[PDB]
Design an enzyme around this catalytic site. Sequence first.
Site, PDB file in Angstrom:
ATOM      1  N   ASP A 141       0.802  -1.280  -0.049  1.00  0.00           N
ATOM      2  CA  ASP A 141       0.095  -0.069  -0.045  1.00  0.00           C
ATOM      3  C   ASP A 141       0.830   1.125   0.063  1.00  0.00           C
ATOM      4  OD1 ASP A 141       0.986  -0.743   2.608  1.00  0.00           O
ATOM      5  OD2 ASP A 141      -0.868   0.408   3.462  1.00  0.00           O
ATOM      6  N   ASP A 142       1.980   1.282   0.055  1.00  0.00           N
ATOM      7  CA  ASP A 142       2.940   2.358   0.168  1.00  0.00           C
ATOM      8  C   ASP A 142       2.953   3.047  -1.501  1.00  0.00           C
ATOM      9  OD1 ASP A 142       5.453   3.920   1.150  1.00  0.00           O
ATOM     10  OD2 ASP A 142       6.254   3.100  -0.410  1.00  0.00           O
ATOM     11  N   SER A 143       2.582   4.173  -1.518  1.00  0.00           N
ATOM     12  CA  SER A 143       2.542   4.993  -2.766  1.00  0.00           C
ATOM     13  C   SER A 143       3.893   5.018  -3.483  1.00  0.00           C
ATOM     14  CB  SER A 143       2.066   6.305  -2.540  1.00  0.00           C
ATOM     15  OG  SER A 143       1.942   7.104  -3.753  1.00  0.00           O
TER      16      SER A 143
END
Length: 206
Positions: A159-161
């Site tokens: 989920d890390d951009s």
Amino acid sequence: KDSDYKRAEKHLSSIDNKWSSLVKKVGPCTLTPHPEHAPYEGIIRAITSQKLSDAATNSIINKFCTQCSDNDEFPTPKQIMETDVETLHECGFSKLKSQEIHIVAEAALNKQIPSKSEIEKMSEEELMESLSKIKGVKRWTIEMYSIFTLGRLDIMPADDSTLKNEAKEFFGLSSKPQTEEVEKLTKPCKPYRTIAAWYLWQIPKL
DNA sequence: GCTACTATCG
DNA sequence: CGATAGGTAG
């Protein structure tokens, strides 16, 4: 540890070619977690980093340590409660974060946070269910704590951009991938997905 | 020189 | 909804 990295690196070199090529270019993994840090400290550090680069986060913590302490040590729970949100905010913590960090310190004081030894026994799923009960602490923040404080090796922060951006070009995708897509594309990296993520994170540095 | 770049709450 | 933390790469 540095032995886990050897094994990790060899594994990522045994998947498909692009992984093998990335490892060679980036070189040895230099990820340095800090399991010595107590839960409330690693959590506050993770919270602080929310939406901020490592550099920004670090200047904020530097101030926090210089002001709310004597021997430029990480402030203790009591020292943290003895500080008001206005003052915490002057360090660079957002007003919201100042409040959450405050609750975290108080919780550490009242033994409302799982002890380290107990956290060490929790699977990531259990850890997620447990710490997500804390205001300002969710999936992203808990993965960062698991990686940089705990030192867990199979954490994939899908989920890390930034990781998603790096995943987009690494896998040659047409658009920024959704969280679940990064999840299955990195499945072959088990059981060293943390190291895999670290490597994807070094891509800009090339 | 200038900007873009987690999780919560009225 | 739509602000909100800041150093720094591009």
